[PDB]
C-alpha cells in the first residue's frame, strides 16, 4: 500500500492505516507559479488542523466525541456500513449533510469546556 | 443500543478542483548547457522511479474535452515563448523599400517565382554613415506596392524580432506534477472513448514525458496507440467540432532541404546583429517529403473500417484536401532544426473507399516570417540554417472534420482540419484528471468520550 | 453573534463562545500584494500556536496552569473582574504586564516536564 | 543561555531547557527573495509538527513511546550516554539509523490506536 | 458637517460635504472626427 | 516636429478665437525611406 493505495477498498481495511494517506500532504516567470502553489497547498493543511483543533482533540486523528447522532441521517444498520461500502460512496451519500454535523461538534465541545473547568475548583 | 458520531482524518476521498502545475525535468535534459526554450533552468528537476500504483474496486469518470489541463498548458507555452524573444536583438528598422527582381541560377522551373535577389539601404553600426547589403528573400515574404518596388508584409502590420540565435527550438519532453494535496488519476483502460466510466484507473505523482510539438494537422512525435485504434470525438454527429484519431503503427516521414544556404552577418546597430541569406552553393532544388505507399494505404485501410462502426457498415468514405486558408489551416506545419515548413498535403487525402518501393513526393514552399499562435500583434523571423536539414519523424495522429448536413447520403467525406492548438495537446492529456483530496471524514461509531 | 459580535460585552459572556472569534482567522502587479498578505496572515496564526504549543496544552484553548499569581498585579477581588469589566479595558490594564507572565508559564511547565517523566520509570 | 547556548554542552544539561532552542524557529527585486525565504522557513516548521502529530503526542515535546528498542543500535550502557557525550556526536553515530526508527513509532502507535478505541464501547 | 484638522491653522485644507445633491451639466457641442495616422509598423496615432 | 502653424477661421465664435490651429508636419510613415505629411487641429495650451 502507498499513496491512496486503498482508496477504493473496503472502509474497514482503509481505516487500518491513515498516516500513509497523510504523509504526502505537505511536501523568473515560473517563480511566481511555484510560490503560489506552495502557499495554497500549505494553507489548506492548516485549515484542517484549525477545524480539528477547536474540537476535543489535536492530532490523535481518531476523535471520539459524545455528541448525539440522528438516526434519520444514516437509517442503516452498523454491520453493512463497515464491511463492503467504500469511502467514496459514503461521501456522496452525505453530500447534503454538510455544515450541520460540524456545528453539533463545536457547540457540544464548548458547552462541556466550561463544565470541565468548574469542577477543578472543587 | 445507541451509536454516536466520530470523525476520521486522512481518509482517502477526491473531488474536482482547479489548480496549476509545475515543471519536472529529467537528468538527461539537465546535461545540456544551452538555455533554450523549455529549458531546465526555470524548470525544477524531476525524481526517478515514480510511485505509480494500481487502484481496485473503484470507478472514476473522465472527460477530455472539458479538462482544464489543456487550457492552462496552452497559456503556459505562449507565456514562455514570449520570454525567449525578449533579451536579444530587435528587428524594428528592417522595413525599407526594395527595388527587387527575380534570380536565375540554373533554377528549376518548379520553383521559378520563389527566390528574389536585391539589396536595400540599412543603417550601419554608426549613424552618419550609410551602406547597402543584399540578400535572398522568399516569395511569401514580399508583397506588391505601387516601375518596380517591393516591401515586406511585416511593415504594414505589427513589427517583431527574429528567433534568438542562441537558443534551439527542438522539442523537449517534460513532466507535469501537481503540488501537495493534489494527485493525478491516470486511466489505463484499453477501450476509452474520452467520456465514460474508467474501471482501470491508476494514480501517479507525475506524468510521462510530453513533447510540445508544433503542428496544425498531422501531429508529429505523439503518443502511439497500443491496439484497436480508437477515434476521439465530442459529439460525432455535430460537424462543428473536430475529430481526433490516432493510429497504432508508426508511419515514418522524410523531409529534407537540398538547398545549400550560407549566413551573412550584418551590423544593424551597436551590439545588434541580423542574419540574412547569402549566395546559394550548388544546384537549386525544391524541398519535398516522402511517405511509403504501402505503409500509408495500410494505415488508412485499417482506420477506415474502424470509423464505419459509428456511422454504418455500408458507408462510402472519401478523403478531400481542403482549400485556401491563407496558409494557416491548409498546410502541414512542422519544424526541423529551427526552420518552419508549410507544405502541401493534397497527396495524402486523395482516396475513396468502397463498402466491399514507390513513395509519394510533393513539392511545396518555405517562408521565413511566421505567425504561430497567430497573435495578430506579433510575429517572428526565421533565421537561416547552415548546411542542409534532413529530419526524420513519425506520424501518430490525424485531424478530421465532417461535412455539412446535406442529407442522408452514404457518400460521406472526411476532410482534414487543424489550426487549433488546443486540440494538439488533447491527444496527450486525455488520460489525466486533477483531483482534490479532503482528509476530513465523518462516520458513526460506538464510542464515548469520558469526562 | 458573529465575528467579534460580543467584543464590547461583558467578559463573562464573551468567554462562553470562542470558536466564532477563531473561525475567520486563517481564511500581475496585484499578485505580489495578494501573496504578501497571505503569507503574513498565516505566519501570525502559527506564531500563536507555537507560543501555546510549548505550554502544557495544544488546542484546548482553555489552558489551566499551576503557576503562581502575584496579588499586586491585579489587587482586586474576583467578583468585579468577571461581571462588568470588558476585555478591552482589561488589556489596557496589563499593558506593562507583558513578556513577564509568559516567562513564568514556560519555566514552570518545563520544570514539571522532567518531574512528569522520572515517575514513569518507577 | 540563549539561542543554541548549550549545543556543545553535555546532553544531560541541554535537555533541561528546550523552548529556548525552539523560540527563534519561526520569526522590487528583493521582494521575491524575502517571500521565498519566508515560505521555505515556515514550511519546514510545519513538516516537523506533522511528523510529531501522527505519533501519540502533539506539543508535549517529550514524547514517551512504548515501541521496542534494539540493543545492537546503541550497544552501550545508559550511564555513559547521558553525562559526557554531546548531542552533536550522538547525531553522527545514528547517521545510518534513519528512516527506520520512525517506521517503528508509526506502526506501533497506529496499531495501538484501534486498541484504544474498541475498549471504549465495552 | 465640516471636516478639518485644526481649523485655526489655515495651512491645511477644509473638507466639507453637503447633504442635498446638486446636479451638473457639461456638454461638448463641437463635432470631432478621428484620423488614423501610421507612425510605424504596428504603431497608430489618432489626431483630430 | 517643428510646426509652421497658423490660426483657423470657419465661422468660429469670437469667444474661442485663439484656441484652434490648423497646420501639418513631417511625420515618418510605416516605412523609413519614404516620407509624408499630415495635418490636424491642436489646442492653444498644447502649443508654445
Ligand atoms: C498541392 O499539390 C497539388 C497536386 O495536385 C496542386 O494542384 C496542382 O497544381 C498544379 C500546379 O499549378 C496544376 O498543374 C496545372 O494544371 C493545369 C492542367 O494540368 C493538368 O492537365 C493538363 C492537360 O489539360 C496536363 O497536361 C497536366 O499534366 C495536368 O494533368 C494547367 O493549368 C497547368 O499547365 C501548366 O503547364 C503548361 C506546360 O505543360 C503551361 O503551358 C501552362 O501555362 C501551365 O503553366 C498545369 O498543368 C495541377 O492541375 C493541380 N492539380 C492537380 C490534380 O495536379 C496544388 O496546387 C498544390 N497546392 C499548393 C498550395 O501548393
Ligand atoms: C521528432 O522526433 C525526431 C526523432 O527523434 C526528431 O528528429 C531528430 O532531431 C534531433 C534534433 O534536431 C536530431 O538530433 C541532432 O540535431 C542536430 C541538428 O541541428 C544541429 O546543427 C547545427 C549545425 O551548426 C547546430 O548548431 C545546432 O545546434 C544543431 O545541433 C545536431 O546536433 C545532431 O547532429 C550532429 O550530432 C550528432 C550526434 O548528436 C551526430 O551523429 C551528427 O553527425 C551531427 O554531428 C543531431 O542530428 C536528430 O538527428 C533527429 N533525428 C533522429 C533522432 O532520428 C525531430 O526533431 C522531432 N521533432 C519533430 C517536429 O518531428
Ligand atoms: C462513449 O461510449 C459510451 C457508451 O456507449 C457513450 O454513452 C452513451 O452515449 C449515447 C449517446 O449520447 C447515449 O445514448 C442515449 O442516451 C440517453 C440515455 O442515457 C437517451 O437519449 C437514449 O436512450 C440513448 O441511450 C447512451 O445512453 C450512453 N450510454 C451510457 C451507458 O452512458 C458515450 O457517449 C461515448 N462517449 C463519446 C465521447 O463518444
Ligand atoms: C450533437 O449534435 C446533434 C445534431 O446537431 C444535436 O442534436 C440537435 O440538437 C439541436 C438543439 O436542440 C436540435 O435543434 C432543434 O431540433 C428540432 C428539429 O429541428 C427542433 O426543435 C428545432 O427546429 C431545432 O432544429 C437538432 O434538431 C438536433 N439534431 C438531431 C437530434 O439530429 C445534439 O444535441 C448534439 N449533442 C451534444 C451532446 O452536443
Ligand atoms: C526515408 O529515407 C530513409 C533512407 O533511405 C529510409 O530508411 C532507410 O531504409 C533503408 C531501406 O530499408 C534502410 O537500409 C536497409 O534496410 C533494410 C533493413 O532490413 C535492408 O534492406 C538493409 O540491410 C539496409 O539496412 C536504412 O537503414 C533506412 N535508414 C534509416 C535512417 O531509417 C526510410 O524508409 C524513408 N522513409 C521514411 C522515413 O518515411
Ligand atoms: C492650530 O493652529 C494654532 C494657530 O497656529 C496653533 O497654535 C499656535 O501654536 C504655535 C506653536 O506653538 C504658537 O507659536 C508661538 O506662540 C507664542 C505667541 O506668539 C510664542 O511662543 C511664539 O512667538 C510663537 O508664535 C502660536 O502662538 C499658537 N497660536 C495660537 C494659540 O493662536 C495650534 O497649536 C494648532 N493646533 C494643532 C493641533 O495643530
Ligand atoms: C441639465 O439639463 C437637463 C436636461 O434639460 C436637466 O434635467 C431635465 O430637467 C427637465 C426639466 O425639469 C426634465 O423634464 C421635465 O421635468 C419635470 C419632472 O417633474 C417636468 O417638468 C416634466 O414632466 C419633465 O419630465 C428632464 O427629465 C430632466 N432630464 C434629466 C436627464 O434629468 C437638468 O436639470 C439640468 N441641470 C443639471 C443636471 O444640473
Ligand atoms: C519574374 O518571374 C515572373 C514569373 O515568370 C515574371 O512575370 C510574372 O508573371 C505573372 C503571371 O501571372 C505575374 O502575375 C507576376 O506578377 C509576374 N512576376 C513579377 C512581376 O515579379 C516576371 O516578369 C519576372 N520578373 C523579372 C524582373 O524578370
Ligand atoms: C545577387 O546579386 C548580387 C548583385 O546585386 C550579386 O553579387 C555579385 O556577385 C558577383 C559574383 O561574385 C560579383 O562579381 C559582383 O561584383 C557582385 N555584385 C555586387 C553588386 O556586389 C550576387 O552574386 C547575386 N546572388 C545570386 C545568388 O545570384
Ligand atoms: C524523396 O523522393 C524523391 C523522389 O523519388 C527523391 O528524389 C530522387 O533522389 C534520388 C537519389 O538518388 C535521385 O537520383 C533522383 O533524381 C531524385 N528524383 C526522383 C524523381 O527520384 C528524394 O531523394 C527522396 N528523398 C529522401 C530524403 O529519401
Ligand atoms: C432521410 O432524411 C430525410 C430528412 O430528415 C427524411 O425525410 C422525411 O421522411 C419522412 C418519412 O416518413 C417524412 O414524413 C418527412 O416529412 C421527411 N422530412 C423531410 C423531407 O424533411 C427521410 O425519411 C430520410 N430517409 C430515411 C430512409 O430515413
Ligand atoms: C491669430 O489670432 C491672433 C488673435 O487675434 C492674432 O494676433 C494675436 O494677438 C495677440 C495680442 O495680444 C498676441 O499676443 C498673439 O501672439 C497673436 N497671436 C498669434 C501671433 O498667433 C494673430 O495674428 C492671428 N494669426 C494669424 C496667422 O492670422
Ligand atoms: C432528527 O431528524 C429528524 C428528521 O429530520 C428531526 O425531526 C429531529 O428533530 C432530529 N433530531 C434532533 C435531535 O436534531
Ligand atoms: C441533495 O439535496 C438536493 C435537494 O435539496 C437534491 O436535489 C440532491 O440530489 C441531493 N444530493 C444528494 C447527493 O443526494
Ligand atoms: C548553377 O548555379 C549555381 C548557383 O550557385 C552556380 O554556382 C553553378 O556554377 C551553376 N552551374 C552551371 C553549370 O552554370
Ligand atoms: C540607397 O539605395 C539606393 C538603391 O536602392 C542607392 O541608389 C542609393 O545611393 C542609396 N543611398 C541613399 C542615401 O539613398
Ligand atoms: C554547402 O556548402 C558548404 C561550403 O563550405 C560545403 O562545405 C557543404 O558540403 C555544402 N553542402 C552540401 C549539402 O553540398
Ligand atoms: C489500399 O489497399 C486497398 C486494399 O486493402 C486497395 O483497394 C486500395 O486501392 C489501396 N489504395 C491505394 C491508394 O493504393
Ligand atoms: C517512431 O516510432 C518508433 C517505434 O519503434 C520509435 O522507435 C522511433 O523513435 C520513433 N521516431 C522515429 C523518427 O522513428
Ligand atoms: C510580587 O510582586 C511584588 C511587588 O512587586 C514583589 O516584591 C514580589 O517579589 C513578587 N512576588 C513574586 C513571587 O514574584
Ligand atoms: C506603563 O508604565 C509606564 C512607566 O513605566 C507608564 O508611563 C505607563 O502609563 C504605563 N502604562 C499603563 C497602560 O498603565
Ligand atoms: C535487532 O537487530 C539485530 C541485528 O541487526 C537483528 O538481527 C534483529 O532482528 C533486530 N531485532 C528486532 C526486534 O528488530
Ligand atoms: C554508514 O554506513 C556506511 C555503509 O553502509 C558506512 O560507509 C558509513 O561510514 C556509515 N556512516 C557512519 C556515520 O557511521
Ligand atoms: C457629427 O458628425 C457625424 C458625421 O457622421 C454625424 O453623424 C453626427 O450626427 C454629428 N453630430 C452632431 C452632434 O451633430
Ligand atoms: C517637410 O515639410 C515641409 C513643410 O513643413 C515641406 O515643405 C517639405 O517638403 C517636407 N519634406 C521635407 C523632406 O522636409
TrEMBL record, chains A, C, D:
Glycans are attached at residues 70, 77, 96. The chain crosses the membrane at residues 1-16. Residues 92-122 form a coiled coil. Residues 33-51 are annotated as: Immunosuppression. It is a single-pass type I membrane protein. Residues 1-13 are annotated as: Fusion peptide. It is found in: Virion membrane; Host cell membrane; Host endosome membrane. Disulfide bonds join 57-63. This is Transmembrane protein gp41. The lineage of its organism: Viruses, Riboviria, Pararnavirae, Artverviricota, Revtraviricetes. The gene is env. The chain holds residues 517 to 660 of 860 of the full protein.
From TrEMBL, chain E:
Signal peptide: none annotated. It is found in: Host cell membrane; Host endosome membrane; Virion membrane. The CD4-binding region is targeted by the antibody b12. Belongs to the HIV-1 env protein family. Envelope glycoprotein gp160: Oligomerizes in the host endoplasmic reticulum into predominantly trimers. In a second time, gp160 transits in the host Golgi, where glycosylation is completed. The precursor is then proteolytically cleaved in the trans-Golgi and thereby activated by cellular furin or furin-like proteases to produce gp120 and gp41. Transmembrane protein gp41: Acts as a class I viral fusion protein. Under the current model, the protein has at least 3 conformational states: pre-fusion native state, pre-hairpin intermediate state, and post-fusion hairpin state. During fusion of viral and target intracellular membranes, the coiled coil regions (heptad repeats) assume a trimer-of-hairpins structure, positioning the fusion peptide in close proximity to the C-terminal region of the ectodomain. The formation of this structure appears to drive apposition and subsequent fusion of viral and target cell membranes. The mature envelope protein (Env) consists of a homotrimer of non-covalently associated gp120-gp41 heterodimers. The resulting complex protrudes from the virus surface as a spike. There seems to be as few as 10 spikes on the average virion. Surface protein gp120 interacts with host CD4, CCR5 and CXCR4. Gp120 also interacts with the C-type lectins CD209/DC-SIGN and CLEC4M/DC-SIGNR (collectively referred to as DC-SIGN(R)). Gp120 and gp41 interact with GalCer. This is Envelope glycoprotein gp160. The chain holds residues 270 to 317 of 860 of the full protein.
From TrEMBL, chain F:
It is found in: Host cell membrane; Host endosome membrane; Virion membrane. The mature envelope protein (Env) consists of a homotrimer of non-covalently associated gp120-gp41 heterodimers. The resulting complex protrudes from the virus surface as a spike. There seems to be as few as 10 spikes on the average virion. Surface protein gp120 interacts with host CD4, CCR5 and CXCR4. Gp120 also interacts with the C-type lectins CD209/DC-SIGN and CLEC4M/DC-SIGNR (collectively referred to as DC-SIGN(R)). Gp120 and gp41 interact with GalCer. It comes from Human immunodeficiency virus type 1. Highly glycosylated by host. The high number of glycan on the protein is reffered to as 'glycan shield' because it contributes to hide protein sequence from adaptive immune system. It comes from the Viruses. The lineage of its organism: Viruses, Riboviria, Pararnavirae, Artverviricota, Revtraviricetes. The CD4-binding region is targeted by the antibody b12. Glycans are attached at residues 4, 7, 11, 22, 26. Disulfide bonds join 5-23. Belongs to the HIV-1 env protein family. The gene is env. This is Envelope glycoprotein gp160.
Amino acid at each position: 500500500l502507498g499513496f491512496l493505495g486503498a482508496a477504493g477498498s473496503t472502509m474497514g481495511a482503509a481505516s487500518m492505516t491513515l498516516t500513509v494517506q497523510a504523509r504526502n500532504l505537505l511536501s523568473t516567470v515560473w517563480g511566481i507559479k511555484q510560490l503560489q502553489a506552495r502557499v495554497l497547498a500549505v494553507e489548506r493543511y492548516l485549515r484542517d488542523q484549525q477545524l480539528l483543533g477547536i474540537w476535543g482533540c489535536s492530532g490523535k486523528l481518531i476523535c471520539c466525541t459524545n455528541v448525539p447522532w440522528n438516526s434519520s441521517w444514516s437509517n442503516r444498520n452498523l454491520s453493512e456500513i463497515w464491511d463492503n461500502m467504500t469511502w467514496l460512496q459514503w461521501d456522496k451519500e452525505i453530500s447534503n449533510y454538510t455544515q450541520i454535523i460540524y456545528g453539533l461538534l463545536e457547540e457540544s465541545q464548548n458547552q462541556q469546556e466550561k463544565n470541565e473547568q468548574d469542577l477543578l475548583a472543587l | 443500543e445507541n451509536l454516536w458520531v466520530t470523525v476520521y482524518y486522512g481518509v482517502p476521498v477526491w473531488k474536482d478542483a482547479e489548480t496549476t502545475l509545475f515543471c519536472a525535468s529529467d537528468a538527461k535534459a539537465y546535461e545540456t548547457e544551452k538555455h533554450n526554450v523549455w529549458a531546465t533552468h526555470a524548470c525544477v528537476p524531476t525524481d526517478p522511479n515514480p510511485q505509480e500504483i494500481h487502484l481496485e474496486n473503484v470507478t472514476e469518470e473522465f472527460n477530455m474535452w472539458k479538462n482544464n489541463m489543456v487550457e492552462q498548458m496552452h497559456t503556459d507555452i505562449i507565456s514562455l515563448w514570449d520570454q525567449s524573444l525578449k533579451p536579444c536583438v530587435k528587428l524594428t528598422p528592417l522595413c525599407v523599400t526594395l527595388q527587387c527582381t527575380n534570380v536565375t541560377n540554373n533554377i528549376t522551373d518548379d520553383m521559378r517565382g520563389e527566390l528574389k535577389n536585391c539589396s536595400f539601404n540599412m543603417t550601419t553600426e554608426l549613424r552618419d554613415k550609410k551602406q547597402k547589403v543584399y540578400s535572398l528573400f522568399y516569395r511569401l515574404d514580399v508583397v506588391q506596392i505601387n516601375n518596380k518596388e517591393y516591401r515586406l508584409i511585416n511593415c504594414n502590420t505589427s513589427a517583431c524580432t527574429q528567433a534568438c540565435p542562441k537558443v534551439s527550438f527542438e522539442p523537449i519532453p517534460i513532466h507535469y506534477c501537481a503540488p501537495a494535496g493534489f494527485a493525478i488519476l491516470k486511466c489505463k483502460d484499453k477501450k476509452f472513448n474520452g467520456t465514460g466510466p474508467c474501471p482501470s484507473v491508476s494514480t501517479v505523482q507525475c506524468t510521462h514525458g510530453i513533447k510540445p510539438v508544433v503542428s496544425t494537422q498531422l501531429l508529429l512525435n505523439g503518443s502511439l496507440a497500443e491496439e484497436e485504434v480508437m477515434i476521439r470525438s465530442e459529439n460525432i454527429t455535430n460537424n462543428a467540432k473536430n475529430i481526433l484519431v490516432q493510429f497504432n503503427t508508426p508511419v515514418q516521414i522524410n523531409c529534407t532541404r537540398p538547398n545549400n544556404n550560407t549566413r551573412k552577418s550584418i551590423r544593424i546597430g551597436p551590439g545588434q546583429a541580423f542574419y540574412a541569406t547569402g549566395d546559394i552553393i550548388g544546384d537549386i532544388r525544391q524541398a519535398h517529403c516522402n511517405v511509403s505507399k504501402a505503409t500509408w494505404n495500410e494505415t488508412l485501410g485499417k482506420v477506415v473500417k474502424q470509423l464505419r462502426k459509428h456511422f454504418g457498415n455500408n458507408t462510402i468514405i472519401r478523403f478531400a484536401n481542403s482549400s485556401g486558408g491563407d496558409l494557416e489551416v491548409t498546410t502541414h506545419s512542422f519544424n526541423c532544426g529551427g526552420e518552419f515548413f508549410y507544405c502541401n498535403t493534397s497527396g495524402l487525402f486523395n482516396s475513396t473507399w468502397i463498402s466491399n518501393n514507390d513513395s509519394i513526393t510533393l513539392p511545396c514552399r518555405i517562408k521565413q516570417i511566421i505567425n504561430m499562435w497567430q497573435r495578430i500583434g506579433q510575429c517572428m523571423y526565421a533565421p537561416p540554417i547552415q548546411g542542409v536539414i534532413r529530419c526524420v519523424s513519425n506520424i501518430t495522429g490525424l485531424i478530421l472534420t465532417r461535412d455539412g448536413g446535406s442529407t442522408n447520403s452514404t457518400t460521406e467525406t472526411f476532410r482534414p482540419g487543424g489550426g487549433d492548438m488546443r486540440d494538439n495537446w488533447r491527444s496527450e492529456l486525455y488520460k489525466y484528471k486533477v483531483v482534490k483530496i479532503e482528509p476530513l471524514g465523518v462516520a458513526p461509531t460506538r464510542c464515548k468520550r469520558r469526562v
